[PDB]
Predict the structure of Lysine--tRNA ligase.
Amino acid sequence: VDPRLYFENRSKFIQDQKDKGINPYPHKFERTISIPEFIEKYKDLGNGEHLEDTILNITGRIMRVSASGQKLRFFDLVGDGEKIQVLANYSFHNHEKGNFAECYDKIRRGDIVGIVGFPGKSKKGELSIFPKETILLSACLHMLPMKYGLKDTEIRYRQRYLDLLINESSRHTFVTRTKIINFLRNFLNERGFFEVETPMMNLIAGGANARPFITHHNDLDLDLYLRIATELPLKMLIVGGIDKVYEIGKVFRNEGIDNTHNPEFTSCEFYWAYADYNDLIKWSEDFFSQLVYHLFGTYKISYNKDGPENQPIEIDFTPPYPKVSIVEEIEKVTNTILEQPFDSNETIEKMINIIKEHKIELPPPTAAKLLDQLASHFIENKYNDKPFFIVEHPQIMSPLAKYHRTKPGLTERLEMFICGKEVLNAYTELNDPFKQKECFKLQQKDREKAQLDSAFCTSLEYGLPPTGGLGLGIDRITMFLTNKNSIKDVILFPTMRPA
Amino acid sequence: DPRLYFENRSKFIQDQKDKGINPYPHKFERTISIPEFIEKYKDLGNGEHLEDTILNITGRIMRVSASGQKLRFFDLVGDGEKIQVLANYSFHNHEKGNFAECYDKIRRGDIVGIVGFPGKSKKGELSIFPKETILLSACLHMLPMKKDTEIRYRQRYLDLLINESSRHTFVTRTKIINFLRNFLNERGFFEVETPMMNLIAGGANARPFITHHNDLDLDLYLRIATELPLKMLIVGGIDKVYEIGKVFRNEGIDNTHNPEFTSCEFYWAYADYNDLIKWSEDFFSQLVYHLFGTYKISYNKDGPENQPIEIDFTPPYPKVSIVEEIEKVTNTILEQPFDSNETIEKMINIIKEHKIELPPPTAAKLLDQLASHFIENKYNDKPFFIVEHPQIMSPLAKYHRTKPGLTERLEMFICGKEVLNAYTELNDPFKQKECFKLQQKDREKGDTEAAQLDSAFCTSLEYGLPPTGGLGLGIDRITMFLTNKNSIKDVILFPTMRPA
Ligand SMILES: C[C@H]1CCC[C@H](Cc2cc3cc(O)cc(O)c3c(=O)o2)C1
Ligand SMILES: C[C@H]1CCC[C@H](Cc2cc3cc(O)cc(O)c3c(=O)o2)C1
Ligand SMILES: N[C@@H](CCCC[NH3+])C(=O)O
Ligand SMILES: N[C@@H](CCCC[NH3+])C(=O)O
């Protein structure tokens, strides 16, 4: 029909109710029971049975309107993701409260109502509330979309409340997200880790390699950068003696947006004094295996990697997972030998040309950037049926990772991928301040062609114990455990191009 | 000379490297933590050694002393607990190096790993008796003694290492958030995350922070509150929803203001103002007893140099209507409309006559100034509610069902400081835009802290927001009163500060 005319008529209805003295937005309706609790109490009720002496006050949203004549009105009432039917029969209406037809003729799809009624099942077995009075609590002034109208449109992301009301799978996705975070918090808390809050506005944005957001505090007259990671202050806390410390919160990176990149996303980083790379590998295998089984009762799950049209693949989270050394694998699959140093002009041009030969995009072509593109194009999709680790990244890729205790030029680093998407980053922590500043200076010369924080370097000088730290991408993990191809689908309000 | 001392320790590190020793080993497997060590061998007779039991233990050295050529003593601390180290020349593994040369290297602050056996000293001190002591990470600076300055805020790791009280404060902070989360979760509430970057910063009266996303060429405001997206979730059918996280306000800094701080907002469909007062009394009373085993706490409102006072969180708490109480204390009549030039001019004259500082003197700012100077310190021995704020002051609160011009709003104070804000939510879409249109009139007068209108929020209300009660908590300020702190800086690990 005409949505605009429909909204204007509903707006006039609201005003006309006010002119007649009715308040269409009452202050308080005292509910006796919720819709889920009502399904629970009366599901085992007789086919056709009534409990007319049990009077209840319930609320919900009308999501379907139908009629069987003037004296039998049928509705769908939804709440907390669950639904019952409303059977309004003239025979049971409390005529002292008003005229039957004038009450229910007013109801529209979407209206929030409060119902005083009694429980029963229809002749057909359909669990129902039988009102004796229905009261409008909050009207829906627009036409609700069809499920079809939300299918391939971004109304889901710009009007998420419509998606939550119309699509049952939407509520389930975000319930799983909270369950994932709850399980991660308990998993760490049971292991003695201490949750903290580190600043989101900082003089320097470090702990990763990404362009930051900038903002300004007026009263201090200070430019501040939003955190791109929580890594650096969490290590300062380890120096402070919080030997098991973690944080779950937002980080911000001023980068490209796509199906795996939201400018603000949720990370968890934990730091574990006296642990090393081996402890972090075992932690990763323990956590993901127990999380998947906590949620699905099994280690195998299906994931529509190629969209809902193509058939799904199966991801087996049974430990252990394979470990692939980045340099050795690139060397193996390319039939090249990457001599050290990796940032020598010899190895750079060697990586540049094997980039050019395989028709890949040359990144600023730094040795770190080239190695990333090589692993991205030759390793990261090695496994799709199972998560897997890429390990032992070179030092020039890992300015904060401790040097490999036996393999020169490499670090004790790990990255876990699921279907070619990084969800985990961990390594033995670099705690030698002299080796740390040398890593900071090389990035600055790489900059001239993240910033070094003197406060972090100073804290290393008071003694950082041997430590292992780990970071998780919560949204990306939720994607795979909710069968979603876009990060927009697991964030309630994702960052959108403005309308 | 600390600069000389750091220079010597740095040279020691390099010379240790030149000789053949790694001063920062990769891995040492700890057998037992220091808390487990105390808890397991507290039941030891004075002077007994369990020399058959060989343990690997780690910690930070915090004191170094010596008796002769063959005995050396240390404090080893970890996880806020401390044990003694008795390095005796009798038990030293000489195959690893010279006894004196091994322990001469150790300085206060060094992280070490110890292989040794448990025992108590002759005096009764629980101790680890090393057979080998390995340097794991040196402290290259002199560690100060028990740091009572700005150092605590810029070098929090030092404050955590040296001051026992610092660790307990932040432990209590995390305990408070844990209790809050469990409290809401067992009541059926659903935790969510909403955007911290937005086209508009609504939900409160505060100046925002602005930032810019390069690839989209789009200015974005940091959220000043979580009200608006959360209520949109109520529209979406999440009838019990909440969020615990950071918000950002571009304001002045003081003992109760950090530019970023932690808030909890929860929204509860089919509840109202009265359910919210009930929740506040239940939550605060149970929280205080959870932490303390009593509803009464001590707080040094006037600093440690002055006598403390008792705060009784036993419910119920007093309720004070703002306009009526101001009118009573001020002996004037504040007529509606409160934003009329007449009522504004009188409130200004009340502030001038009383030698209080005039605020942009908007009606809402004037009322709040009058409440702060005449109402909010009425009760210090107990928390209390200021209630029934005018429409002008609360553009998102539902109008009072019996009192014209007021709303069904409450804010709870402790020792004059706001820690809670709550009200029956305005859910009439046509009243909300009127409230939005009115606050832009105040924004035209220079009110940088006037809430902007979110058309996406107004649209969501047109799809039907059920009757709802919402509530906000200032987590940091609550932590202050429950850890006996007079500054918000003392309950945030790294408060906002200028560069060194
Ligand atoms: C903290 C990290 C630990 C494990 C690796 C992932 C990597 C990652 C990067 C990223 C960058 C964006 O600009 C936007 C995003 O959404 C993401 C994301 O989701 O994940 C997170
Ligand atoms: C979400 C609110 C609900 C309950 C009332 C407090 C008020 C409050 C405001 C504030 C403003 C700042 O600019 C810095 C801060 O630190 C704070 C703070 O701590 O508390 C929070
Ligand atoms: N800060 C890292 C995560 C932790 C890495 C191990 N310290 C990142 O942004 O990916
Ligand atoms: N947004 C409010 C807290 C919630 C008030 C009740 N909806 C504030 O910043 O104070």
Q: What stands out?
A: Residues 164-185 of chain B form the longest helix (22 residues). The two ends of chain B are 21 Å apart (CA to CA).
